[PDB]
Amino acid sequence: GKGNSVSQTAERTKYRSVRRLRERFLLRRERLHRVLYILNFLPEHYAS
Amino acid sequence: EEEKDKTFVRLKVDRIVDSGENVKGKILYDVYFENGWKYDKQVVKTEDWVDRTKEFIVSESILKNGETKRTFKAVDSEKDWIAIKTKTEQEIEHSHKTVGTYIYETLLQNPKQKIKGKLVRTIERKFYKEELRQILEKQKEFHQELQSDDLYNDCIRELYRNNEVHQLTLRKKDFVHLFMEDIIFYQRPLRSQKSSVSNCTLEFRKYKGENGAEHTQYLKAIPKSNPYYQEFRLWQWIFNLNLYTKDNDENVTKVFLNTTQDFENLFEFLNTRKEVDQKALLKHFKLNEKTHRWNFVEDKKYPCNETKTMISSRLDKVENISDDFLTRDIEQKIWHIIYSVNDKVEYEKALKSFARKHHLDESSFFEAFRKFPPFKSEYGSFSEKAIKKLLPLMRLGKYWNYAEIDKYSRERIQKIITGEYDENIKDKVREKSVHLTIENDFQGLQLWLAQYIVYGRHSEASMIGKWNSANDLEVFLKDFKQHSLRNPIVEQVITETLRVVKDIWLKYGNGTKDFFNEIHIELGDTRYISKYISGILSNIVRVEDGSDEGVNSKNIVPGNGKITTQLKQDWGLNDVWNDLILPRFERMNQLTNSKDFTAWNENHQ
RNA sequence: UAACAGCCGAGGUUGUGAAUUGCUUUCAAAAAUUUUGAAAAGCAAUUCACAAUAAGGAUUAUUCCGUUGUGAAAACAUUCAAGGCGGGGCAACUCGCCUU
16 A cells, blocks of 8 residues: 555565675675785785 | 765754744744854754754855855764764864774774774775775885786786786786776676667567568667757647737737748747746747736746757857857767766766867866766657657758658658559548648648658557457467566456456357457556556457447446445345355354344344 | 666674683582682673675676576576667777668
8 A cells, every 4th residue: 555665576686686795795805815816915824 | 066064063052042933823933053053944842952962964055145055954873874974974084094093093092992883884985995095005115016017917817818908908007906996996887777768669670580580679769868859849849839818818829920930930049048938938929928828837847958058058158169169960969978978987088088079178168068967867759760750841941841851751742742542541641631732831740740741650549459269368468578567466466367367268168259248347556457457358359340449448347336335235145245254253253252243133134 | 656677885693713701510629518729611791803694506707696477398588680870988888870
């Protein structure tokens, strides 16, 4: 009668967006690791 | 605005002098602060305003008069996201230190203070950008590796081995740019939303695909900000204008607007403005408010091709140029430059390039065009192809030309002025277009006549539609597109209705067409589904002889609550329902150990 | 008014390490069954750093799929052509125009 996120697709999109943000953060971290390793800035055990 | 103050401060009210605003039997006061500020809105209850520390986010705007127009808005500490954001912003700002340094200092003062989620939750990304740049440019001196080039090529190659272009582009930057603008703070632009734009209903293209067939691609809708569409709408409004007077309320039109010169003058006058209204339209004819009107709302304004006027205003503000730089090509190119490039820095680059290519000074043109408002998200019904085809027909005077018309419309006009018979010409055409005796009479045309002249179809008459069996209904169900309604509930209800009618036809018709004779629909927020379901179900029991024609079949007879309840009470169905539902009621009586759930009546005994 | 879809933010939770201090038990000693002590474990509190955040499956593009709908094909819908008249930035990419 009023409507407040009254749809299954809405919550599906919400979950998808959250997952997408998480994956973007993980990709950024991966690229940072690769750059720091090729520059040799990380500690030995961490890079191991 | 250059200020964007939005400053969060906590102020205590000193006194509340009575402002003498007696509304609904209560006199309102004002608000005075120590700094010398007053709340713009009035105050009624004094219990929550006397000598209390009230905090607001205030924005100061410099008006043309020369004084700040301070705004006030109630905010609550640690409860409002914007309030917390602004408080942390100001706390970092007046320290004149980096946000990490601010967190440090807070840790120095109180080791027990929690940082994340409480001290600094939300701030602008620019603060982190500033601190991180500062630390990288500081460390770049000490570490020679941050100034090397072999490692900077190696890391670029690692990141973009399969991208030669991005490798070559980035080979010109430093490590600071990689860490800031390519890895950490890179944020992807919005995905293009043009894929959902509606299709033109007039222009089609036919092509042979890889599947050994020949099918049609549609044309995307023209943006409503297109100068062609703006001109088309302005021409439509100017031609549709009919005037009325105030004394005898007669149709004074066709007297002050009879020749082509008056319409040409009206168009040229409306080009120089952005929005026509009552006063401007009346003054254009030297008329007055007290004596005449324009058949429409006396206090409403309509679009008047504001893009051209805005472009002219900006190209006059740049100055140091003649009054001949702006033309139709320049207007279209400006529209393309602004609307196509939806990114700030790339918009700046495009504006600078546009100023460079033309022999104009890029001193104030860039400043005028950098604050150009992004165009509103709206698209027309048709495309630019249809408007380009149709526009020559509508214009009158020097803007009316027979040369720009394409082959098809010209041939159709020649056929309709010749009076010969074509398979695409009906008696309706000769009835409507009997006044088009000469090719010059095609002046000041309207949308419907010009549309039929161009394409050959009179408006939208639909295709009626008849389903010969459940095969058509199941094909339509299979081809039904999801999320094609207002909400999922209605679309799923309609889909299940279609499923059940398919099943019942298959069972009780046994593959025999026209088994159903009438279908009645009852609904009982949900009102919009009636027309759609009637249109869908019309395709079954429609009568093709012509005695049943229109948007909906006459066979579909909607119901209402009145007839339902009347027939249920009169035909004994209410009694049937009551006796059918009784057993739960005497069980309820038994479990309740009371007789209140069933009441005896003597009128029915 | 609403659908659909996209770019991002701050928490919270479980888990690892760490700073401080707790409750219970046992090793574990002294003292008058009881008090105190070294150590270990179990369970936590406050703060910081890090991991995971639907189970899982790809990939190395600055890419993703995983809570929607149809229905037996474990198959799909939610991407879907060819060129040309071109503009936009250091370009990738994107936005206007035309014929099959």
